[PDB]
Amino acid sequence: DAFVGTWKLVSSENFDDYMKELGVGFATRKMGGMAKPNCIISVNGDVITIKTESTLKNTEISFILGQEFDEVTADDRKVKSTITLDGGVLVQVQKWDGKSTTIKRKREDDKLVVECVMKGVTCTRVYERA
Numbered sequence: 001d002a003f004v005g006t007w008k009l010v011s012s013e014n015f016d017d018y019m020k021e022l023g024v025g026f027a028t029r030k031m032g033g034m035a036k037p038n039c040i041i042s043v044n045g046d047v048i049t050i051k052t053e054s055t056l057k058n059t060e061i062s063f064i065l066g067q068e069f070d071e072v073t074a075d076d077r078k079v080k081s082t083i084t085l086d087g088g089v090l091v092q093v094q095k096w097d098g099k100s101t102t103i104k105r106k107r108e109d110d111k112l113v114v115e116c117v118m119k120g121v122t123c124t125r126v127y128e129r130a
């Protein structure tokens with residue numbers, strides 16, 4: 001849809017703090033911080049796929065809006081994830097060990113803006129079309 005495409009990371013703010021609040025250790029944070037991923041979003045019928053590709057780490061999720069699914073995150077959390085579309089924003093929550101984090105994806109001008117929240121930390125990542 002508005003989201004379909006191949007997107008390249010162009011800016012990131014507070015990602016290290018976000019990962020630290022998730023409990024990610026130094027080595028994985030190091031990898032994550034200097035990753036410049038592509039994000040490839042596609043849709044086929046009810047099923048949306050989001051691939052995140054980078055030199056040292058790839059991930060992929062496929063889901064139906066509103067249907068919880070199991071996910072292994074890039075930092076190796078085993079979470080229960082649910083993604084919904086609200087006012088044009090793809091809102092993902094991940095739940096594990098009584099914690100949650102939200103990842104909101106929205107389209108703004110030429111950007112795919114990703115806002116990641118864990119407790120008091122807010123990270124903003126901006127992707128542009130490849």
Ligand SMILES: O=C(O)c1cc(C2CCCCC2)c(OCC(F)(F)F)nc1C(F)(F)F
Nearest residue numbers: 019032035052054057074075103114116125
């Ligand atoms: O899409 C993103 O840019 C993104 C990317 C990553 C990984 C992707 C592979 C390379 C390293 C970074 C990620 O990892 C999960 C955690 F941050 F927790 F490590 N979380 C997100 C985001 F939160 F924003 F969805």
